[PDB]
């Protein structure tokens, strides 16, 4: 109802206003972002999956998830503090010979509501698309970083996955996970297995 | 010896609207409307 007393939210004639804070839900031989997402990861939004001789497991990237969560939190607080909301109106009454004032008051009251409704819907439908594009960009940066670290040691299958030519154990997987993967110690066996094939 | 890069999914049925597409399923969402 438009008539409010106290500290009250702003009145809009909208039925649904929902804002994205997460990813797109695309469910589903574990493959990368081209096939879809993984249900079995509950540590973070973005991450890795390793399958080797010792075992198979999932892991999450903490830094990218934390930066994304910080930007989405700032987005939420920007939406909340942008529209300061306070006592708006109580309504006025007019007699039978002040019809022009009554129509002017209705014109003002019905002209502000349209502007505020239009502004709220535009804000939601722009910020949702910005959030989704930001998530896709972050996944692309992780893929580029892992590719740039591995170079010629591993082959691309497409589908966001890499197959190691050499033998890569758990410390080898954690080396490319945390950003410190030294090239030369695994280069020779990878050269042999690449040239033999 | 395979490493892959992907993201997180669950069983949520929350839907939002964008400029290209309507009824887009998302993992998490916040309601800004009180009714």
């Amino acid at each position, epitope marked *: 109802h438009p008539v409010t007393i106290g500290e009250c939210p702003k009145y809009v004639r909208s039925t649904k206003l929902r804002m994205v804070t997460g990813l797109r839900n695309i469910p589903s031989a574990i493959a990368g972002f081209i096939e879809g997402g993984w249900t079995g990861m*509950m540590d973070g939004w973005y991450g890795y999956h390793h399958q080797n001789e010792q075992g198979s497991g999932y892991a999450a990237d*903490q830094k990218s998830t*934390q930066n994304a969560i910080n930007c989405i*939190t700032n987005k939420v607080n920007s939406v909340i503090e942008k529209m300061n909301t306070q006592f708006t109106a109580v309504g006025k009454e007019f007699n039978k010979l002040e019809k022009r004032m009554e129509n002017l008051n209705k014109k003002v009251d019905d002209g502000f509501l349209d502007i505020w409704t239009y502004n709220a819907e535009l804000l939601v439908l722009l910020e949702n698309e910005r959030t989704l594009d930001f998530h896709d960009s972050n996944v692309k940066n992780l893929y580029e970083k892992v590719k740039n670290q591995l170079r010629n040691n591993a082959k691309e299958l497409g589908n966001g996955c890499f197959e190691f030519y050499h033998k890569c154990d758990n410390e080898c997987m954690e080396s490319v996970k945390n950003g410190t993967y030294d090239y030369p110690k695994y280069s020779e066996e990878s050269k042999l297995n690449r040239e033999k094939i | 010896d395979t490493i892959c890069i992907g993201y997180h999914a669950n069983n949520s049925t929350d839907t939002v609207d964008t400029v290209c597409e309507k009824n887009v399923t998302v993992t998490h969402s*916040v309601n800004l409307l009180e009714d």
Partner: antibody
Amino acid sequence: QVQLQESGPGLVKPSETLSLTCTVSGASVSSYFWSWIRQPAGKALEWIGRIYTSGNTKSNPSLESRVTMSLDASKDQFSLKLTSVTAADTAVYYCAAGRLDYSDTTGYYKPPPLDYWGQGALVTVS
Amino acid sequence: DVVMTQSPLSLPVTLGQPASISCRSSQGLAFLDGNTYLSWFQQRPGQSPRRLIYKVSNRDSGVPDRFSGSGSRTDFTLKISRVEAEDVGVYYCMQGTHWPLTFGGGTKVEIK
């Protein structure tokens, strides 16, 4: 009943390493976030850092270089290791536990809740 | 970090009178899950701290009904309707949204 008890040395010399252990009884260690909080005499509380069972320690930016935490499920013990101690580190130390939900993804990326506190141990540096 | 400001430092009240403590934040404390995460703690003299209010309005089990907290955006308030002899001590406000976890300055309650 979840009961937490602290034990450690009262006196440490300067430039040494201070160690405290927070023995937990009544509940498993895997179901909680574990945090350390220090308080100087007649001053404000200060948060040091937190740890969960799989393993990550996020500590306060100021005390990041000199802090190290660990947890053992066999003896149900939570440990602190503070290196290069100074006379400004004289404080009462508390260990706190908060609830962990494995389905909640975002809960790993905010400060943990503080539900069950501990008795506290006094450490002076002289 | 994020700065908490409490008012007043000392609030002497008489038995059977209401009291109010105010906590203010430099930043908004809303999280992306839809919550605020501000807590109110009590410390008796020579004892460990215990919690009174978890989140803006929710009250912990074992806490008396005279403790009520409310607030929004950047200003929050804890109110005690009746003050007894077990209400002495120092009260703090804490935020758990942004890294690192920051505590308030502290408000001391004395009986007149």
